[PDB]
Amino acid sequence: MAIPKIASYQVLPLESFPTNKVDWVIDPKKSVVLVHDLQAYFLNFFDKTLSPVPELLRNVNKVTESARSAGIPVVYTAQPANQDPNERALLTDFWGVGLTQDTEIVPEVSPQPEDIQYTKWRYSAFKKTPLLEWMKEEQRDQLVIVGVYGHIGILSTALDAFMLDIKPFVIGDAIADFSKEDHMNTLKYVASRSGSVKSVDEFISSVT
Amino acid sequence: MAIPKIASYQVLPLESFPTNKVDWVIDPKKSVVLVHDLQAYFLNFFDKTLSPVPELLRNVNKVTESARSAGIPVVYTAQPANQDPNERALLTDFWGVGLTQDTEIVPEVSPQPEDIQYTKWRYSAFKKTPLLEWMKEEQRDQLVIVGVYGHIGILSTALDAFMLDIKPFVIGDAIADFSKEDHMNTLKYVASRSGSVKSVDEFIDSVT
């Protein structure tokens, strides 16, 4: 009903990432980076000075910097404050009325002027946003996903993308979750059923 | 890459169903039963004489028969043979070219003349089908889900339904999966993040 006070946990070692079942490789000419719901509201459920938040933010910055250097668009999603109950619909039964403040992107990974920002309404970044038709317009069919929370919005976004013929790449050391278990199980599900799991360094070397 | 030979396992005990976080009640005036992908092709991956397939088929029949007695529409989904690779898209990377035969619903749960049958293209029964707009036409906003496989199509259909303002009810003893673990984890995920988990008897009692 409430997002938990998330206890600190260690970013999983890269050697523990689950093995990919598909062999897609991130292509700078075909990819978009999604910074998923990195709002103050959602990150304040962690103690930000503790693992995995400093590493998460540094890794998100590594991703977006390499992305912009390679001409890869960066898209941020953010939930709006004070959502109309008709618009929020069944989310209220699970999570309450939703955030009423602290909607800003956390300052460490604040958007740059050329980045795109979409208003998010559901777990999946494709529902009620321009994301799908804009990616088609840009003729980019790869979505590189960073942010929070792994087993909820990241997972659901990966599953629409996959079903919408967009290749999702979840960056395993650039997401965070309710627990190390939720984080890992997110990666195991994606790698075996819905997309690709890559490291920050694999993204960087793929996009130079 | 190939659907495994699925080892037999026991239907999970009713006392082990996860507790629901929401208090939705199945209403015969607002509900639809979805029989998800109960095709010979998908069920032949199991030894159908062993649990959980006999219980699955007679529980699906219990559900659909009480549904029709209550005026609840029954919708079946079925994948078509020899899918166009351009239409099948990224499924091919994970699973191969897909079924080429054995497309019929298994005779134990064969559709009745009044039931609806849709051609299915993705994990979620909502993608590239009329299901969402037909439910809106019928003014029914509850989807009671039975069939296979739990962590793949059942889960994705429930997530899509939830995000599309349709309440999903997954019938825990009328689905089956790759393993007892996948089956349970499907129910735990739905009950905590995406819908309601009910038993066959709870459905029967709810729709009289």
| Neighbour tally for A88: CB within 10 Å | 20
Burial class (CB in 10 A: 0-12, 13-18, 19+), B84: exposed
Q: Is the dihedral angle over the CA atoms B158, A21, A175, A162 positive or is it negative? A: negative
CB contact under 8 A, A189 and B151: yes
Active site residues of A: 37
Q: What is the DSSP letter of A127?
A: T
- By what method was this entry solved? X-ray
Question: Could you tell me the two tokens for A102?
Answer: 């602290």
- A1/A15 Cα distance (integer angstroms): 34
Which residue in chain B is spatially nearest to A120 when comparing CA positions?
B163
H or E stretch at A55 = helix A53-69
CB contact under 8 A, B159 and A156: yes
Quick one: how far is CA A106 from the chain centroid?
14
CB contact under 8 A, A124 and B94: no
Backbone angles phi, psi at B52, to 5 degrees: -100, 20
* Strands lying side by side in the sheet with B142-148: B116-119, B74-78, B31-36, B142-148, B167-176, B196-198
Q: What angle do CA B31, B33, B34 make, to 5 degrees?
A: 130
B1-208 — its CATH code?
Answer: 3.40.50.850
**Residues near A114 by beta carbon (within 8 Å), at least 6 away in sequence:** A68, A74
**Residues near A142 by beta carbon (within 8 Å), at least 6 away in sequence:** A24, A26, A27, A30, A31, A32, A166, A167, A168, A169
Q: What is the DSSP letter of A186?
A: H
> Around A203, how many Cα atoms within 13 Å sit in the side-chain half-sphere?
33
Domain residue limits, chain A:
1-208
For residue B22, the chain A residues in CB contact (below 8 A) are 93-94
For residue A163, the chain B residues in CB contact (below 8 A) are 122-124, 127, 156
Backbone angles phi, psi at A196, to 5 degrees: -120, 145
Mutate to test the interface with A, among B79, B90, B193 (most CBs of A within 10 A): B90
